Amino acid sequence: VTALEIENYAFPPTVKPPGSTNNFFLGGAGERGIQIQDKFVKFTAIGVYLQDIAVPYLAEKWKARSAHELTDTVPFFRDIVTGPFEKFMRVTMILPLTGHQYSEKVSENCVAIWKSLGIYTDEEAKAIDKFVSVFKDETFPPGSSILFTVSPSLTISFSKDGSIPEVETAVIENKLLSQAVLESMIGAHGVSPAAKQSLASRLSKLFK
Template sequence: MAPPPSTTTSLQVESVVFPPSVKAPGTATTLFLAGAGVRGMEIEGKFVKLTGIGLYLEDKAIPSLAVKWKGKTAAELMDSVHFYSDIINGPFEKLAEVAMIVPLVGMQHAETLSKMCVAIWKAEGTYTDADSATIAKYLEAFKDQKFSPGSSILYTTTPDGLVMVSFVKDGIIPETPIVVLENKKLGHALFESVIGKNGVSPEAKQSLASRLADLMN
């Protein structure tokens, strides 16, 4: 395996520090920090920061993406929907860490994400009974879960279509995920929600473009 990209450093988003690399629960792969940013929303006319999102990629993402994107500037990458699509659909492991800045009720998070996925699949005409079963299993994992500031939800996706969900509390990354879902569409939708065309964290997209441009060049 290639060594982790040498220019990778930790990133701080508000009170959250994302380390330069992380070993995904349930896999033997160590992933490097490709970018991070805040996610927030307008509440009564004020922008409220809710979570920090760190995006980690397998080392082979760099040569895979460089075939098409090497030589592009960060600004060019940021402006390209296809660049982010190539990350979302790329044949390498990915991990998104959703770290709490404010307290979060687990079921509220899971239901919001589930509704978005189902709406996309229904609009595409691809929603199936298997997808419905996946969503039910996903929601069950968040039942009665509460996340305090500093705790995290980890989403790991593999090229063969596994989605592994893990909870980090008290700073301890578990060795095994809390649930493993076999649904490639769900993995794509999770990352689409963060860095896709209408992704929830423009700051994370900018960070990703900047760091990957440097690594590829």
């Protein structure tokens, strides 16, 4: 596939997440913004990479549907989130964020929606606690990146720019946390509609 450039940040077509050794391709990328006082403040640029094997898996079930169709289909993105393949997310900050600011916002989203499905055990709370522990002292100037590998486990890595380090920072062995992080971005209530549309556009075409 092709590379994508989002808000002056470049996402190449392939990456090598640090922990894994599988091949990944850029499924899509998009900005993430919030609405404050009449203005859409763009905070991050998100790149969603998928393991190569995701194309045959998704091609079987989502072939013959237009990009417009896939964007609305909620089960299409749930398959991207939960499929039996690795996912890698790059979150590059457009505006500066502290790790506490980032993890707290990640935290409530993940905890509340887990209460939606009545799957919130005391284990996920421990996963959340570790997640917050990873981010506690981190700071993320413009251009720095938060890297997530979602594996059938969540691997967390940090970079001061857009490059991928050779060694992660932490691994959290929880399947729901690893999935929630990605759901919070490209899910039904996903904070990056633009990443969803990029994913819809690029994967449907790949299915051809």
